[PDB]
Write a protein that binds this DNA or RNA. Structure first.
Ligand code: SF4
Ligand SMILES: O=P([O-])(O)O
Ligand SMILES: O=P([O-])(O)O
Length: 219
DNA sequence: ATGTTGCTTAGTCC
DNA sequence: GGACTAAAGCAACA
């Protein structure tokens, strides 16, 4: 199917009962946004359809993409990620605002699970379910040469996608693994506030990941 | 009030 | 694998 069909069918998905419930349950729970409209639906990927680089996240944040409708938009993860994409020369501007004209150059963003999960922890069954969408979405990104897993969950999801053994591809920040056709699989700590604010993942470390991804992608 | 909540990782154990 | 938990620094939240 083409992208329009992908977006149409994805947004109507209701395969995971716990997530169909949670994504609406959190609406109005955060003071700063009470009374505002929430997307509260599956989150479609965003970016360059001709991207050579794919940043693969974990899932929608309750008041992040689950609220704005765009990956990494409206929360601490995006506050960290988007300015860095611009600093690396991969976007039109530093900030991402729903409904703006932000363009990503050579990069596309999505995640393992597309509906906000409780405690940011999807179940093994929910991951297997949404993996069907990963197949469809990555299938619509023919030019990707570098797949960047943001966090352990994301890496494992990508390993399943490529039919790779976990034992041979452990999760460690900076890990680099080869993929068929001269492609690459990179692993980085997730951009979560828990990782950046605690010093586990610094702005320097992530920009480096981005610069390495560009290098490996021929950009 | 100032204590609680919410935002992954790495190690443990079966 | 999968379930469980102590640990990390910050600030909205109550
Ligand atoms: S998480 Fe994925 S599979 Fe589950 S309901 Fe949402 S879009 Fe569908
Ligand atoms: O809502 P996310 O894309 O920042 O997880
Ligand atoms: O932000 P607070 O401290 O007025 O609740």
């Amino acid at each position: 199917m083409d992208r329009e069909a992908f977006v149409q069918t994805l947004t109507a998905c209701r395969l995971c009962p716990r997530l169909v419930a949670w994504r609406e349950e959190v609406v109005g729970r955060k003071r700063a946004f009470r009374g505002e409209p929430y997307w509260a639906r599956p989150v479609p990927g965003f970016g360059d359809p001709e991207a050579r680089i794919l940043l693969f996240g974990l899932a929608p944040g309750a008041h992040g993409s689950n609220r704005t409708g765009r990956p990494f938009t409206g929360d601490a993860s995006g506050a960290f990620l988007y300015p860095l994409l611009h600093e690396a020369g991969l976007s039109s501007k530093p900030e991402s605002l729903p409904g703006d004209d932000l363009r990503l150059y050579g990069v596309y963003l999505t995640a393992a699970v597309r509906c906000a999960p409780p405690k940011n922890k999807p179940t093994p069954e929910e991951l297997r379910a949404c993996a069907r969408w990963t197949e469809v979405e990555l299938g619509l990104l023919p030019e990707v040469r570098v797949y960047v897993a943001l966090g352990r969950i994301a890496l494992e999801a990508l390993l399943a996608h490529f039919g790779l053994r976990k034992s041979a591809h452990p999760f460690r920040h900076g890990a680099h693994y080869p993929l068929p056709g001269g492609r690459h699989l990179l692993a980085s700590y997730h951009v979560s506030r828990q990782n950046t604010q605690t010093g586990r993942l610094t702005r320097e470390m992530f920009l480096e990941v981005l610069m390495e991804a560009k290098r490996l992608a021929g950009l």
